[PDB]
């Protein structure tokens, strides 16, 4: 049974070894070449674990635990898995001393609970009012990613965008990120990006003859597409003057189809099907704006943000169901055109237009932005925040070291190992920064003899212990707290296994 | 993760090694034999990277970065990729000293920013007025290419041609190269080439071949008949005989509509029906059998609009010209739309004895146009021939001490990597690289002699500016940015994982 | 001819690699097991190169150059050979750039001359008066060795001892270390050691006076044994009287010497046991075989002459002393000739608990004597700990630009090779070499902080001069000359041809 655990532990350390390079802001990236041939370079753990497949089932479960977090932000996964790795690494050293795993687990459980407690007790509170901090958080979150052009601009836009959707529910701050629309274009600098308080539709209008500007536009959201009379009736013809009139009836059918909708009268209509090129002219004749196939995602985000309902059947329409907007417009941002539904009736209306010079590079800003949104939303929803840069881990360590003596012997060693495994993560951080890990970590914890200097962490640039909070190195209290729970979960779920009997074939 | 970086760096140095031969005016060429069998010899990096395919993805991204320069000219790509190569070469030596890559990147970033600053501060300003300089620039740009016959003539024509399109937009000089038409013929010397201030079209004997004050009708419709086959299979039962004439009357009805306004020249991008020829020739109208490119360039340059549908015609929207003519330049004939209404109207007729050789002048000319356009749009220019790099080097060497230690070494390496490029230049010239570079930088103890660079012919350090060795300040500046970009984007990778 | 140079350079780097561990105060030691079986641990380069034999002739010449330093102290040899190593290491990198060796040599020559100049210009003057500094120097010199017990005591005794022998010759301070006597005993602490201003004889009849006042010393370099009549005459057995004649011969031998009447006699031969009683009968002190070394040191220090023949004696030749005594220092007894007539009279008694350990203090003391003597004779001293090398480096880096190109690179390489030595120092101290060196040179932007060097204990750049880290200006200066000598004498060789 020891070889099986050795195998599983090896499996974990393999992942830790894979990701260890990418940890920290001054980390390393990994390239991934699609079978198609498309190249994708990244350090974001979610994408790495995604594209990098594993055959070892414990690996699949491990990734399932680390990656499969409840939260929208992929931030904290790397931290969790690396920690799991370190825990397993020390665990091995505990096993070498002839300690039955259940003991190690029990010690790790105490250690995790107290880690959480230690995070709780130190976690400085933060209010949505203290906007600058939220900007610092956004900065820290998005800064770590490959793109570093105009971080301040983006972070600013992030905080401003997030603060808009937030609402008081039972005096508790609730936020729904589905309320934020996110659209992408190719070409253009990073500065050319802009937020919109209305709903943006990434499309070109169906006809040049339509009004491209409507004031106080009401929006009709129709999820309907011709009729086929072949199976209904064999279209037999032997007399040529007959069919000619048979034709016009079928156009009159379409007219009958559209007239119903023309009766109530819409200002703008959007459907998720290829628009027939005759309806264009008839809709253009009335002075109505239309759009070609937009995806259901934007339609559903349009639905709640406009104060209307999306309608499956075009015959069941009611005059209340249709959304209401203040301004609709179309414009050229960069080279291509886009549609903009500005000043929607719903107060929690937000959109963001993103742009990158290269089509593959703009995708990084997406993955960098999503986390920058979520991470801040998680600061808002929680109401606590903590200075990263190693200011946390060492406190957990010193805590567990001070607590370990008075837990009884065999757990104590597991707890101490836990503390060392927590500490070693900062060393991993420093390794990636090119500095001496030991020297710096010891320097750090040696500076924590004073409780005032609790926020002191390593700056990977100066290479010197400095106050992380003042330097704008803040992170969410929760996202870093969950990493410990997922990591402990994983390691315990590795040490809890004795053998595998998987069914091949 | 070290082996992956070694592989990528190797991948870069492979490209550097491929191109290193072709760098500089006195460089080497590379032959490329098409699968068809056609042979193509060239040194132009774009074509080399084009025809030479790479399987290594980092290579594809590398070429994507180097080629993927914002500007119209392929000039500067070689410079960039070679520099990237040198940077990687020194980087290796930095890694051998146990320096984590992020440090190297940080140092290279500082080095790049300061390189740009150093280019900015020294870059002599240049105005469109100082035409001779622009000629010297054109010369330097086009001279490096395989063809060296009548460089002065061409450069002159280039500068004259470019200066015509330039316009003041918000007191800032804007230029659009789409305004320049470029047509090619086979056979004839290099001197027989000429520019035209009107629009040249590279294309019935009974039509008037000369029209005064011609109005040009731009018809993007098939002048061919309409096909009643799919419409109606016609069964023969003297009836069909008239069925014929109706169908000619259709064409007459088609043309008469267009004959309403009364235009003197018509052009369409479809095979012209041989009955419309006689009817159009009967009126005394000139016609032609042409690509949409020239039509779109004709559109804006004549003061008219290209017409999609022949039924929607208006009496405005046909272009206006002063003179139209046709002539034999060399063996074949060409059409010339001279004295267009739009002021920014330009065309150029190019000719080479051999059909494959005239294509080189094209690739040599495009860059010679862009390069000068980039001098105009920017408003700065710098003497090449190594006068730049050594200053960057000395700058970074003087700046490196006061940046902190571990960055300082990366910066110094950067400076050495910048310097080594001139050595590469000298290697291709057959001279001793070290001796000459050191000779150069040793002459820069005096700032007056800042423009001193190597002459590849005399082999002696001389003032490059006075010898007409000038280049655009921007195109050489972008190379550093793309090169740094690439190298950093190589050192930023730790491992690759392909799917399936 | 390239492979021969590669081999020789390899040969040098091998030695550098051998010694690199032992460099600096916080260095490493090396154990050496004699063929006899006796073990000897040491870091002192002289002993390492001694006991470690090399077959490669260039190695023998190399050690011959490094060891073969003009000066009394073995200090500076390691520094020299390591520097030679670094120079060769960079030289390799210069050769890789296709630079003919003579160029490298020329550059290294300029670099060496300017290194010497740079040492001259910065070298703070020091006078014999500023005794505390001399103590700091002694400390620095002796401190690096294995023994660290009671360094202050020893250094103090060193300075006091050396200052006594120094004499004004043409107003220039001359010192002769042959004037200092050095004797050793086994067992006893390091504190139990003491200096004596008279001449100490390390030796043991009980009937003789062991204390004489104002003793005149007779230096007899003749066998006090009988003369052998065996070869002269095989005697057949009267004999009883034949005996007494032969005692009367000894009496006749001694009486002659008893003429002047000296109080102490010393000879370097086993003393006949009959002369003992006759000499003891007069009330004279004698000693058993002492070595000629102490006799020659006794000769000049007592104001007398050593006598080859006992028949040529004169009443003036004999030395004069104020006090003679014998005493038990530790377990064994020793003879002490105190208050000699010659003013430059010095002796030192050294003692270690272990017989092998006391030998280290010897080798540590000799250098501590010489090193200070070299500060006195020169009149200059310099703060070690890296405060020197970085200045040489910055100097050569600032000077290199204006020497012409191909030399400039050799000079820069020299500077880097000088710098790298401190890194080697820091490596042995367990700290990061690069970081610390860069930290050092970055602190030298201010000239005031010129003496800043690395402290191997705090790990921080600090003023070496104030911390008592001073060394002789000359001994460190000669190392550069011997190192350059060696490296140039390696790069000057193209091939070797032996007689097989
Ligand atoms: N500006 C910063 N300065 C110092 N440390 C930072 C900074 N930003 C982030 N970190 C550190 O980076 C660690 C991990 O960040 P990163 O690897 O980019 O994402 P993740 O949190 O998913 O691992 C955190 O533990 C945090 O302490
Ligand atoms: N007449 C010249 N004298 C010296 N150097 C020149 C001259 N013309 C061009 N060069 C050098 O050639 C280099 C590159 O030119 P070339 O290889 O022909 O095209 P590209 O600009 O794409 O590299 C420039 O960096 C410039 O320094
Ligand atoms: N106390 C000290 N602090 C710092 N450096 C020292 C000290 N003592 C000696 N050194 C350094 O040690 C180096 C070599 O000294 P050492 O090994 O003792 O003898 P040697 O000169 O024969 O190698 C010198 O370059 C000097 O700078």
Extents of the domains making up chain B: 1-125+379-497, 126-196+343-378, 197-342
Report the C-alpha gap between B93 and C406 in whole angstroms.
Answer: 21
Nearest CA to ligand 1 atom 13: A24
Q: What is the DSSP string of A92-116?
A: HHHHHT---HHHHHHHHHHHHHHHH
Residues of B in contact with C402 (CB under 8 A): 442, 445
> What are the angstrom distances between the C-alpha of A324 and each of A218, A221, A286, A296, A352?
4, 11, 19, 18, 20
CA C125 to chain CA centroid, Å, is 23
Report the C-alpha gap between C216 and C224 in whole angstroms.
Answer: 19
- Residues B404/B365, Cβ–Cβ less than 8 Å: no
Report the C-alpha gap between B286 and B212 in whole angstroms.
Answer: 12
User: Residues B420, B422, B424, B430: what is their CA dihedral angle, to the nearest 10 degrees?
Assistant: -140
- Which chains are within 8 Å of B by 3+ CB pairs? A, C
Neighbouring CB atoms inside 10 A of B170's CB total 5
Could you tell me the two tokens for B108?
């290279």
Report the C-alpha gap between B93 and B98 in whole angstroms.
Answer: 9
Could you tell me the two tokens for A77?
């996964």
Could you tell me the two tokens for C9?
């350079």
Nearest CA to ligand 3 atom 6: C385
State the best of C409, C433, C434 to mutate against chain B, taking most chain B CBs within 10 Å: C434
Can you name the CATH fold of A1-125+383-501? GROEL; domain 1 (1.10.560)
CATH number of C1-125+379-497: 1.10.560.10
Residues of C in contact with B97 (CB under 8 A): 434
Q: Which CATH superfamily is domain A197-346 in?
A: GroEL (3.50.7.10)
Q: What is the CA radius of gyration of chain C?
A: 28
Task: Tell me which residue has tokens 């042959």.
Answer: C178
Q: Which helix (H) or strand (E) holds A169?
A: strand A167-169
- DSSP alpha helix (H) spans, C190-274: 239-258
Could you tell me the two tokens for C436?
């610390």
Which residue out of B18, B24, B383 has the highest number of ligand 2 atoms within 8 Å of its CB and is therefore the one to mutate? B24
Q: Which CATH superfamily is domain C197-342 in?
A: GroEL (3.50.7.10)
Ligand 3 contact, C188 CB (< 6 A): no
> What are the angstrom distances between the C-alpha of B470 and each of B23, B480, C445?
17, 18, 38
- Residues A150/A191, Cβ–Cβ less than 8 Å: yes
Q: Which residues are registered as beta bridge partners of C199?
A: C337
Q: Do domains A126-196+347-382 and A197-346 have the same CATH topology?
A: no
Residue A463 CA, ligand 1 centroid: distance in Å: 15
- Residues A21/B494, Cβ–Cβ less than 8 Å: yes
Across the interface, whether the CB atoms of C402 and B442 are under 8 A apart is answered yes
Edge to edge, what strands does the sheet with A474-476 contain? A124-125, A384-387, A474-476
Residues of B in contact with C439 (CB under 8 A): 405
Report the C-alpha gap between C444 and A47 in whole angstroms.
Answer: 48
Across the interface, whether the CB atoms of B434 and C98 are under 8 A apart is answered yes
Residues sharing a CB contact under 8 Å with residue C290, sequence separation 6 or more, in sequence order:
C201, C202, C203, C266, C267, C268
> What are the angstrom distances between the C-alpha of A142 and each of A129, A369, B105, C51, C388?
21, 7, 19, 64, 47
What angle (nearest 5°) sits at the alpha carbon of residue A429, between those of residues A424 and A430? 95
Across the interface, whether the CB atoms of A434 and B103 are under 8 A apart is answered yes
State the best of C442, C443, C444, C446 to mutate against chain B, taking most chain B CBs within 10 Å: C442
Q: How far apart are the first and last CA of chain A?
A: 25
Of C136, C181, C131, residue with least CA distance to C155 = C136
Report the C-alpha gap between B265 and B318 in whole angstroms.
Answer: 10
Report the C-alpha gap between A217 and A219 in whole angstroms.
Answer: 6
In chain B, whose CA is at the least distance from the CA of A30? Answer: B495
Report the C-alpha gap between B199 and B180 in whole angstroms.
Answer: 9
| Ligand that comes closest to the CA of residue C383 | 3
Strands B211-212, B319-328: pairing kind: antiparallel
Residues sharing a CB contact under 8 Å with residue A26, sequence separation 6 or more, in sequence order:
A432, A433, A434, A460, A461, B102
Residues of B in contact with A52 (CB under 8 A): 497
* Method for structure elucidation: X-ray
Residue B22 CA, ligand 2 centroid: distance in Å: 10
The residue ranges of DSSP E strands in B149-236, in sequence order, are 167-169, 172-174, 180-186, 194-196, 199-201, 211-212, 215-218
Query: Residue B497 is nearest to which of A30, A37, A434, comparing CB atoms?
Result: A30
- Residues C62/C486, Cβ–Cβ less than 8 Å: yes
Could you tell me the two tokens for C350?
């050294």
Report the C-alpha gap between C421 and C418 in whole angstroms.
Answer: 6
Nearest CA to ligand 3 atom 19: C75
Report the C-alpha gap between A359 and B75 in whole angstroms.
Answer: 24
Q: Which residues are registered as beta bridge partners of C272?
A: none
Task: Tell me which residue has tokens 């980390």.
Answer: A27
Neighbouring CB atoms inside 10 A of A267's CB total 20
Q: Which residues are registered as beta bridge partners of A222?
A: A311
Cβ–Cβ contact A27 with B under 8 A? yes
Residues sharing a CB contact under 8 Å with residue B487, sequence separation 6 or more, in sequence order:
B12, B84, B87, B88, B91, B108
Q: Which helix (H) or strand (E) holds A156?
A: helix A151-165
Q: If you classify domain A126-196+347-382 with CATH, what class do you get?
A: alpha beta
Report the C-alpha gap between C299 and A68 in whole angstroms.
Answer: 95
What angle (nearest 5°) sits at the alpha carbon of residue C153, between those of residues C147 and C159? 105
Report the C-alpha gap between A432 and A27 in whole angstroms.
Answer: 6
Q: What is the DSSP string of C47-80?
A: HHHHHS----HHHHHHHHHHH--SSS--TTHHHH
Query: Is C460 in a helix, a strand, or coil?
Result: coil
CATH architecture of C126-196+343-378: 2-Layer Sandwich (3.30)
CA B179 to chain CA centroid, Å, is 14
- Residues A324/A307, Cβ–Cβ less than 8 Å: yes
What burial class does residue C425 get, using C-beta atoms within 10 Å of its C-beta: 0-12 exposed, 13-18 middle, 19+ buried?
A: buried
Report the C-alpha gap between A501 and A214 in whole angstroms.
Answer: 67
Of A457, A482, A368, A458, residue with least CA distance to A77 = A482
User: Residues B445, B449, B453, B459: what is their CA dihedral angle, to the nearest 10 degrees?
Assistant: -90
- Residues C222/C307, Cβ–Cβ less than 8 Å: yes
Residues sharing a CB contact under 8 Å with residue B377, sequence separation 6 or more, in sequence order:
B173, B174, B175, B474
Report the C-alpha gap between C177 and A428 in whole angstroms.
Answer: 58
Could you tell me the two tokens for B351?
């000719």
Query: In this structure, what are the phi and psi dihedrals at residue A433, rounded to the nearest 5 degrees?
Result: -85, 0
Report the C-alpha gap between B152 and A91 in whole angstroms.
Answer: 78
Of B80, B118, B97, residue with least CA distance to B397 = B118
């Amino acid at each position: 049974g020891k070889e099986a655990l050795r195998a599983n532990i090896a499996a974990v350390k393999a992942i830790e070894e894979a990701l260890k390079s990418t940890y920290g802001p001054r980390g390393m990236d990994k390239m991934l070449v699609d079978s198609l041939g498309d190249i994708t370079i990244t350090n974001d753990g979610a994408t790495i674990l995604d594209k990098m497949d594993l055959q070892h089932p414990t690996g699949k479960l491990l990734v399932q635990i680390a990656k499969g977090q409840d939260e929208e932000t992929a931030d904290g996964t790397k931290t969790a898995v690396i920690l799991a790795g370190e825990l397993a690494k020390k665990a091995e050293d505990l096993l070498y001393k002839e300690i039955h795993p259940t003991i190690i687990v029990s010690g790790y459980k105490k250690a995790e609970e107290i880690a959480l407690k230690t995070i709780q007790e130190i976690a400085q509170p933060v209010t949505i009012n203290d906007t600058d901090v939220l900007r610092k958080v956004a900065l820290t979150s998005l800064g770590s990613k490959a793109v570093a052009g105009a971080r301040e601009y983006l972070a600013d836009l992030v905080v401003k965008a997030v603060a808009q959707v937030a609402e008081l529910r039972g005096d508790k701050w609730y936020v729904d990120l589905d309320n934020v629309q996110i659209v992408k274009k190719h070409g253009g600098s990073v500065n050319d990006t802009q937020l919109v308080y209305g709903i943006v539709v990434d499309k070109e209008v169906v006809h040049p003859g339509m009004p491209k500007r409507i004031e106080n536009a009401k929006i009709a959201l129709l999820d309907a597409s011709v009729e086929k009379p072949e199976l209904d009736a064999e279209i037999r013809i032997n007399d040529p003057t007959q069919m000619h009139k048979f034709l016009e009836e079928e156009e009159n059918i379409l007219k009958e189809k559209v007239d119903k909708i023309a009766a109530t009268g819409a200002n703008v209509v959007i459907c998720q099907k290829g628009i027939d090129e005759v309806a264009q002219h008839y809709l253009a004749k009335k002075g109505i704006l239309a759009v070609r196939r937009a995806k259901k995602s934007d339609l559903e985000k349009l639905a709640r943000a406009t104060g209307g309902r999306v309608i499956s059947n075009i015959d069941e329409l009611t005059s209340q169901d249709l959304g209401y907007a203040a301004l609709v417009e179309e414009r050229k941002v960069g080279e291509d055109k886009m549609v903009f539904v500005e000043g929607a009736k719903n107060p929690k209306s937000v959109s963001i237009l993103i742009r990158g010079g290269l089509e593959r590079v703009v995708d990084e800003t997406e993955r960098a932005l999503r986390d920058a949104l979520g991470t801040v939303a998680d600061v808002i929803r929680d109401g606590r925040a903590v200075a990263g840069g190693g200011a946390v881990e060492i406190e957990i360590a010193k805590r567990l070291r001070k607590y370990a003596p008075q837990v009884g012997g065999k757990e104590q060693l597991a707890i101490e190992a836990y503390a060392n495994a927590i500490e070693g993560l900062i060393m991993i951080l420093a390794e990636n920064a090119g500095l001496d890990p030991i020297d710096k970590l010891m320097q750090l914890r040696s500076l924590h003899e004073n409780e005032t200097n609790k926020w002191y962490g390593l700056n990977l640039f100066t290479g010197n212990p400095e106050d992380m909070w003042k330097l704008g190195v803040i992170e969410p209290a929760l996202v870093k707290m969950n990493a410990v729970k997922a990591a402990t979960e994983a390691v315990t779920l590795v040490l809890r296994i004795d053998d595998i009997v998987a069914a091949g074939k």
